[PDB]
Symmetry: C2
Subunit: 247 residues, 2 copies
């Protein structure tokens, strides 16, 4: 009568622990959703559901959104948190694809904070401000020339451009060294994201390269946003601790 | 009944629910710890293979066995992943991936029908402007009308593939279908490159995203008419197999 329900409930509790350990919040919700008298069930369901929704729609976690004011900080940190969570569960193709856009976002954001007016945003895309001084543009032209490219003020800025801009404005920036781990997976990422190839982790030191690109993002965050509190880099661990206390 | 029998039946129903939501990794998690679970070894093996194939973008064996053409297989496989994540309401991820699949389909078509038009450098597509001066002239006129300048150093993406087809084959059924994918380009930029939150209820984003996914399916029917209709529903078929092991 009650022995059966006690067994079922204790077993579900351990199952949810395993799933939560693998960041499978939607599966955990699935196991608890129909359980009537389960202790902390309502709060558990609410928290698992809001978390799954935040991940699916790329909504910054409420704790983060409430603690910090800078929108670029919050987005960078949030997408790092998702990135590291995907790596930790070995969603490796997804990790490989996302890392470059995060790196690009951090560098763009960094430049826009420290040299505002250098870059302008038009229709959601970054470009050199056409009001920029020839002193800057001349050096940039020289860097493009090393890269076998011509100067075009109307061209959309991408990762190579951000690296060149930073090379001119702050050549000692540690960002310029951290980004190399992101460049090292560029061809692999092209292969997976655009040519739809299989990711062979056991070839070309890919396990290691992908890991190092994720660590590179974390290091870039420490450099660009030193005001991020260290505990917020461990959001998922903290969240799993909270879930364990409810169970 | 034997407690083991009660545990086995409970796990059986839990796994069926997880499978029904395409949570194969969670299903694996629940069955992995069960030693004497009927067909447990075969299930564990099958769920692991599927999980790994999804994580590394390895074409499913059944697809690899039924179909011969590499581009067909990659296109269909990535549509299957796209639609499976979309069915799970991973809408931001869906929005990001749909464009790359459409680009792959058009690029494949262009490389068959105008093989000298695109030159591939380090796995990336670029307009071969030296061999195709008549095309380059028309393409430049097209960009010039849009107050955009022609830039041979740019990697070709969906807008360029669409322009290529508009010039070379304006009657294309592919060109009609891909418009729904072009329509989510700015939204995708916002989510993928600016790290914004996806608000499905704004500007009927939900509709736009649905139409982009259907566009891929229509394009596959155009390019690869030999794909059997049931293969667009791989996961349903796969779940049937799992259900037979769980009976």
């Amino acid at each position: 009568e009650i022995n059966i329900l006690s067994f079922r409930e204790a077993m579900i509790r351990s199952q949810i622990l395993g799933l939560i350990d693998n960041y499978d919040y939607e599966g955990a919700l699935n196991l608890v959703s129909n359980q009537k008298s389960f202790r902390n069930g309502k709060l558990l369901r609410k928290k698992l559901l809001s978390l799954t929704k935040q991940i699916k729609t790329h909504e910054v976690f409420p704790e983060i959104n409430e603690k910090y004011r800078d929108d670029a900080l919050k987005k960078s940190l949030f997408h790092y948190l998702l990135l590291n969570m995907r790596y930790n569960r070995l969603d490796v193709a997804e990790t490989l694809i996302r890392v470059k856009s995060i790196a690009e976002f951090i560098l763009k954001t960094y430049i826009e904070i420290h040299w505002p007016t250098l870059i302008i945003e038009k229709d959601g895309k970054p470009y050199l401000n056409d009001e920029d001084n020839l002193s800057f543009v001349y050096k940039y032209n020289l860097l493009l020339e090393k890269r076998k490219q011509n100067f075009d003020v109307s061209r959309i800025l991408g990762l190579p451009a951000f690296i060149d801009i930073l090379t001119i404005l702050e050549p000692n920036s540690q960002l310029l060294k951290e980004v190399n781990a992101v460049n090292d997976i560029n061809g692999l990422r092209n292969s997976i994201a655009h040519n739809l190839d299989t990711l062979n982790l056991d070839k070309n030191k890919n396990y290691k390269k992908i890991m190092l690109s994720v660590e590179a993002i974390k290091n870039m965050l420490h450099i660009s946003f030193p005001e991020i509190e260290e505990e917020d880099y461990n959001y998922f661990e903290e969240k799993n601790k909270e879930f364990k206390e409810l169970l």
